Structure 1
Amino acid sequence: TGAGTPSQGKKNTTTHTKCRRCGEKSYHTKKKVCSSCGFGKSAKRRDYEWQSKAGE
């Protein structure tokens, strides 16, 4: 069984969903953690300086 097309058919699991806090479809319904805003992980909002060029 190939890793390509044939294995794409088994994908019918729901993981990332609309997030209650930020509105993005990044709330992982299995981990109960938003990969976009950190909801479920931290009270503070997920943020990182590498999300932009260093001197900006």
Structure 2
Amino acid sequence: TGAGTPSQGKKNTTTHTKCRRCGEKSYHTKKKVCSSCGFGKSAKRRDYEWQSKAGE
């Protein structure tokens, strides 16, 4: 079985979904945590300094 095209067929599971807090389709409905804003994990908003160049 190729890891390529043939393994694409079983992909019918729903994970990331429209997030209730930020509106991004990053809410993992199985994890109940947003990969974008962090809703479900952190009260504060997910944000990192590495999302931009150091001097900016």
- TM-score w.r.t. the length of structure 2 is 0.99
Q: How many residues of Structure 1 are paired with residues of Structure 2 in the alignment?
A: 56
- Superposition CA RMSD, Å: 0.2
Shift of 1:39: 0.2
Task: Please give the secondary structure, in 2, of the residue aligned with 1:14.
Answer: coil
Identical columns (%): 100
Q: What do residues 5-48 of structure 1 show as CA deviations (whole Å, max 9, x unaligned)?
A: 00000000000000000000000000000000000000000000
* Rounded Cα–Cα distance in structure 2 between residues aligned with 1:47 and 1:5: 35
**2:28 alignment counterpart:** 28
**Which 5+ residue runs of structure 2 have no aligned equivalent?**
none
Moved over 2 A (4+): none
In 1, Cα distance between the equivalents of 2:45 and 2:5? 37
- Give me the TM-score of the superposition, normalised by structure 1: 0.99
